[PDB]
Design a protein around this ligand. Structure first.
Ligand SMILES: OC[C@H]1O[C@H](O[C@@H]2[C@@H](O)[C@H](O)O[C@H](CO)[C@@H]2O)[C@H](O)[C@@H](O)[C@H]1O
Ligand SMILES: [Ca+2]
Length: 230
């Protein structure tokens, strides 16, 4: 299947004149239910289609470009079932306070490896992190806008409180190619947390700063299929 997740994901070969650093981000509201409710949080985030089209029924907070660096955070909420304003880490390029206790966040763009070989991406989240990776699975090469909602089965997924609250994906990548990536996050209530790390054989320690790895590219009419193949 075109959008199915694989160990040998498809990469892309855009024209790399003045390449845009970082991923794109969209932030959406995630309102609580009526004050005093039990459960207090909106349960929409667990709906299979919330990450596909459901979030679009919420309020658009911002579109942001150039998301790059260490995107990991643990936000400790002072009180539960309470909307509280605070700030994202510097990497998100978004300085104004938002409801860190309850929000939806979409990131997309391309991952560029440094060293050809196996890559293990490990994720954890509070509440939810769904990752697509590779052309088709995330979106089509330089045809993101037209394929944005057609992402396939997740490469990795983590849901707080579920039987899979931490996950990983192992993929063989070529350093010459750029791999479509989609990261969907939700905090329903209280603490919020996102951890993405990368392990390869070239470094005994994990990579947590993705400054040099995340890119954005304009769509083109014909697309930009990968020009390295084995
Ligand atoms: O532990 C993190 C986890 O809990 C959050 O809140 C619930 C809260 O609603 C309730 O008041 O207390 C319990 C335990 O004392 C939890 O703290 C969130 O619902 C959940 O998203 C997650 O962040
Ligand atoms: Ca939470």
């Amino acid at each position: 299947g075109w959008t199915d997740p694989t160990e040998f994901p498809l990469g892309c070969s855009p024209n790399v004149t003045t390449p845009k650093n970082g991923l794109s981000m969209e932030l959406y509201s995630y309102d609580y239910l009526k004050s005093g409710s039990n459960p207090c949080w909106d349960a929409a985030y667990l709906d299979p289609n919330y990450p596909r089209t459901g979030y679009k029924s919420h309020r658009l907070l911002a579109k942001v470009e150039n998301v790059a660096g260490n995107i990991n955070f643990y936000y400790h909420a002072p009180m539960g079932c309470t909307s509280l304003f605070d700030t994202l880490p510097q990497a998100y390029n978004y300085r104004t306070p938002l409801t860190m206790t309850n929000f939806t966040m979409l990131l997309y763009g391309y991952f560029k490896p440094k060293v050809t070989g196996y890559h293990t991406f490990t994720i954890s989240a509070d509440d939810l992190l769904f990752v697509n990776f590779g052309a088709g699975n995330a979106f089509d090469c330089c045809k993101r806008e037209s394929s944005a909602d057609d992402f396939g089965n997740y490469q990795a997924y983590a849901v707080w409180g579920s039987q899979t609250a931490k996950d990983d994906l192992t993929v063989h990548l070529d350093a010459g190619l750029y791999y479509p990536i989609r990261i969907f996050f939700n905090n329903r209530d209280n603490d919020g947390a996102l951890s993405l790390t990368l392990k390869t054989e070239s470094d005994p320690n994990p990579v947590i700063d993705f400054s040099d790895y995340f890119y954005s590219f304009d769509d083109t009419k014909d697309g930009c299929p990968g020009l390295v193949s084995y």
